[PDB]
Automatic annotation (TrEMBL):
InterPro entries referenced in this protein's UniProt entry, alphabetically: AB_hydrolase_fold, FrsA-like, FrsA_esterase
Single Gene Ontology MF annotation: hydrolase activity
Protein name, per record: Heptaketide hydrolyase ayg1
Pfam families, per the entry: FrsA-like
SUPFAM superfamilies for this protein: alpha/beta-Hydrolases
Keywords: Hydrolase
Keyword Transcription regulation: no
Transmembrane segments: none
Hydrolase is among the record's keywords: yes
Length: 398
């Protein structure tokens, strides 16, 4: 049935084994300081994972996993405190960024938005504090703005915390283009350092916002229209900001954020020059046959429990039964209207969201843009990253 083919019916070897996950993927990813260990150091993680493997802790959702990371984070914060006092601001920033990655992995894969007393929420709260302190020392610092949700209705929260970073020379006389990052299930606003570096290096502003049913997003996760109101608030705030040119704006949806990039490309087409959807779902990812096997593929841990809560469902059974008809951009007809330019990027052999969720968008609305990587899993890294920046350079060209 699925383009994924033989791999669909496979149980991936790291399933329920943090040992195999580490030894076969995460150890290498950590060494290279690439996702999910970007900004991070193997010297910080190897002792923690050796501890987790020795105690045979495989459930990332459990407190035993989360709390294994916190003493390392503490020691890094003290090393940073020492570095700062000695006037070593670059070292202190790096140590705090390293602490942020330790907190990030500790709260993998999902901070439960309904359980604010959870250790993973506490980990995320400490990560944000570490990260803001680290980035306050940058020549172009990341600044948090709490955007009032003026377009809030129903069960929407009041406040939209976003990260903004502006390149050197950005002012009312010379306002700069905007790349608006929409983050994912396991990546929130502090998890995008290198993306902000690249955006600023091309003379653009970086704005980072979390998606409904994650992190500090106030959008009603149960209301499919909640993202539309969320972006009405964010885009209205950016319109007012004198140094940011909203006439040259692109949205960048990462993984779970890809759904929201695709949706926004239709709902807000007249306010966007373009949208990138990186490893997106929009329809077939909520197919019960797909959700039956999604836990058996490349995602480091169980995903269906996190997905249930992120889609505003109290139970996984209720999620599998109801999600597609409610949230599908195809089923609901969101795709049957025009869109701004939309670049779809993924691995052909994505076992997290199906490649069919890129391909189906070519059978609706405006012409779409795509590059899909043969034999590559979810996100189609590393190939899919540099093409992202090539496309932004074209769309935002002077
Ligand atoms: O921002 C992201 C999010 C992901 O889920 C990724 C997965 C694999 C490789 C890079 C990623 C980057």
């Amino acid at each position: 049935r699925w383009i994924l083919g033989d791999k669909f019916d496979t149980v991936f070897p790291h399933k329920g084994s943090l040992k195999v996950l580490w030894e076969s993927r995460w150890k290498f990813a950590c060494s290279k300081s690439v996702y999910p260990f970007h900004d991070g150091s193997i010297e910080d993680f190897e002792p923690i994972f050796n501890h987790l493997i020795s105690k045979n802790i495989n459930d990332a959702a459990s407190d035993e996993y989360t709390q294994a990371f916190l003493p390392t984070a503490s020691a890094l914060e003290e090393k940073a405190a020492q570095a700062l006092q000695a006037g070593k601001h670059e070292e202190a920033s790096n140590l705090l960024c390293r602490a942020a990655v330790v907190y990030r992995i500790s709260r993998f894969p999902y901070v439960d938005i309904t359980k604010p007393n959870s250790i993973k929420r506490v980990a995320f709260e400490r990560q944000k504090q570490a990260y803001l302190k680290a980035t306050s020392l940058w020549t172009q610092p990341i600044r948090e703005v709490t955007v009032p949700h003026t377009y809030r209705t129903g069960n929407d929260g009041a406040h939209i915390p976003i990260y903004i970073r502006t390149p050197a020379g950005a002012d009312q006389s010379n306002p700069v283009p905007i790349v608006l990052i929409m983050t994912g299930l396991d990546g929130y606003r502090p998890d995008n350092s290198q993306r902000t570096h690249e955006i600023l290096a091309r003379g653009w502003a970086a704005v980072v916002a979390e998606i409904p049913g994650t992190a500090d997003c106030p959008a009603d996760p149960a209301d499919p229209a909640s993202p539309d109101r969320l972006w009405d608030s964010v885009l209205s705030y950016l319109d007012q900001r004198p140094e940011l040119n909203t006439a040259k704006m692109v949205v960048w949806g990462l993984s779970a954020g890809g759904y929201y990039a695709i949706r926004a490309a239709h709902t807000h087409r007249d306010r966007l020059l373009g949208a990138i959807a990186h490893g997106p779902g929009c329809h077939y990812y909520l197919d019960p046959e797909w959700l039956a096997k999604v836990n058996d593929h490349e995602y480091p841990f169980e995903i269906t429990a996190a997905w249930a809560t992120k889609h505003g469902y109290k139970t996984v059974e209720e999620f599998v039964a109801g999600a597609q008809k409610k949230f599908s951009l195809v089923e609901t007809g969101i795709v049957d209207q025009p869109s701004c330019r939309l670049l779809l990027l993924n691995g052909v052999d994505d076992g997290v969201v199906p490649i069919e969720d890129c391909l189906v968008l070519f059978e609706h609305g405006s012409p779409k843009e795509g590059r899909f990587y043969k034999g590559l899993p979810h996100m189609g890294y590393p190939n899919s990253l540099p093409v992202s920046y090539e496309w932004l350079e074209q769309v935002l060209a002077s």
